[model samples]
Target chain A: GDLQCLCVKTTSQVRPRHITSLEVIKAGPHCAVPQLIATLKNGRKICLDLQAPLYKKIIKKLLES
Target chain B: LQCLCVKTTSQVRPRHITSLEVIKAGPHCAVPQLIATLKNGRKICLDLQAPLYKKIIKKLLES
Candidate 1:
């Protein structure tokens, strides 16, 4: 079977706007990769932890593909 | 500037899993403008008939 779609449920003040991809802006051990900052189309920023399960899946696909 | 970050672009498959309100539809067989009803009661309009948008719809219904 082919990949259908991938979505993640994240709790944050910045809402999840639909997008085709996410850009990783920061990565460090500040807190085990601390909060990884991603951007929206309008240049708004959202924060995610590197250890977050949803984030791991996203990174895995982005790297593999 | 917000931040000096490496920039990359990725084309996305459009998906609309929200309710739609017909604010307007052109006489042609195309959807020009409509509202995407969100669970939080937010309404936003997006390009519905773009090539990529149509492709996503087709792939979504394919089994």
Candidate 2:
């Protein structure tokens, strides 16, 4: 199992006039990194945060790969 | 790792001055700008992008 296979991708879909930043902290061994960017057809950005359980699974896969 | 271009109106004479105190405060994405200060003297606006800040600090440490 890989402990470093944790991967995270952050995206957002916000209005053209709205702009905001999002941050995610890596707690425990999950190692889920946070990302902030604007990516939407209408200038809207949709942000996401990877949680501990999912991050742990990703880390395990990283160890394998 | 790029040239940090802090744009400022060229002054006939240079002197010690903190960030601008007249410009409207916000993320201007430029240098020589005014920054809000706290009683502790810790600059709140000078802190830059986290990833870029960390990367720069790491590079300085490596050097």
Candidate 3:
């Protein structure tokens, strides 16, 4: 099995808007690297922290309203 | 194993947009990257330095 975690490191950088997509990835047998990955407008995938308060704000907005 | 965000802009509506992703600079990339996806599914790269972008982010993120 492939044990590669997409987001091993977490970043709480400021700034947003014009984002194409926001996604949450849960750890599992395949990888186990549970993290938040956001897709840029340019089709770029970004690795974000899952437990960070700042990031949680973003996730809450995306999931809620 | 790659960096995204070649070009960026700050002309997106707040409500029209549904989601945005934040990417940090590291081994994969040199500069920070951000993208916003609208209801229509159109992807747009955002300029992190733009005040408008910052405002939108502030609006989206909350306690």
Candidate 4:
């Protein structure tokens, strides 16, 4: 009963000119759903659903740096 | 289990945020939790995917 996820709501949708940091969560024993959350310049975090191809694609680009 | 964020949003302006913290998911928690402290001392959970929120955090980190 202690299993709870931080991301209940996710978005499809940053700024160096993009985001503060990108935290990716893959489905595992902790949670059955894979989720992506980005911390931006403003100190807010948004959940980017792993279901979105575009979201995954964008994260791949950021992976380089 | 503790719930820091239920429904998160990026709409909160950066100026209102006094502090920010990230609570990663683990054996105790099922999900990652990102929360913030505002100028009024109120706590708000943030939506990291929101572009606006991301921008604010990135800027704050740079500072």
lDDT top scorer: 4
Q: Residue B58 of candidate 2: its Cα lDDT?
A: 32
TM-score of chain A of each: 0.38, 0.24, 0.64, 0.64
Off by over 4 Å in 1: A1-33, B1-63
What TM-score does each of the candidates earn?
A: 0.26, 0.21, 0.47, 0.44
lDDT of each: 0.34, 0.28, 0.58, 0.62
Compare candidates 1 and 3 on lDDT and give the better one. 3
Lowest-lDDT window of 10 residues in candidate 3 chain B? B54-63
Fnat (0 to 1) per candidate: 0.00, 0.00, 0.04, 0.21
The alpha-carbon deviation from the true structure for residue B22 of candidate 3, after best TM-score superposition, in angstroms, is 0.1
Q: What are the per-residue Cα lDDT tens digits for candidate 1 across A1-65? A: 43221223233443333222343322122222223344454655455544445644443333231
Better of 2 and 4 by lDDT: 4
In Å, residue B45's CA in model 4 sits off its true spot by 7.5
Candidate 2 runs further than 4 Å off: A1-12, A27-46, A49-65, B1-46, B49-63
Q: Candidate 3 docking category? A: incorrect
Clashing pairs in 3: A18-B36, A19-B35, A19-B36, A19-B37, A20-B35, A20-B36, A20-B37, A41-B35, A41-B44
Task: Please tell me what DockQ candidate 4 reaches.
Answer: 0.13
Kindly report the docking quality category of candidate 2.
incorrect
Q: For model 3, give the RMSD to the true fold.
A: 11.1
DockQ of each: 0.03, 0.02, 0.05, 0.13
Give all candidate RMSDs, comma-separated: 17.2, 15.6, 11.1, 13.1
Residue A26 alpha-carbon offset, candidate 3, angstroms: 19
Task: Tell me how far the alpha carbon of residue A33 in candidate 4 is from the true structure, in angstroms, after superposition.
Answer: 1.7
| Candidate 4 residue-wise lDDT, B1-63, digit = tens | 434377565656887787778777754347776777667544556776757667778867876
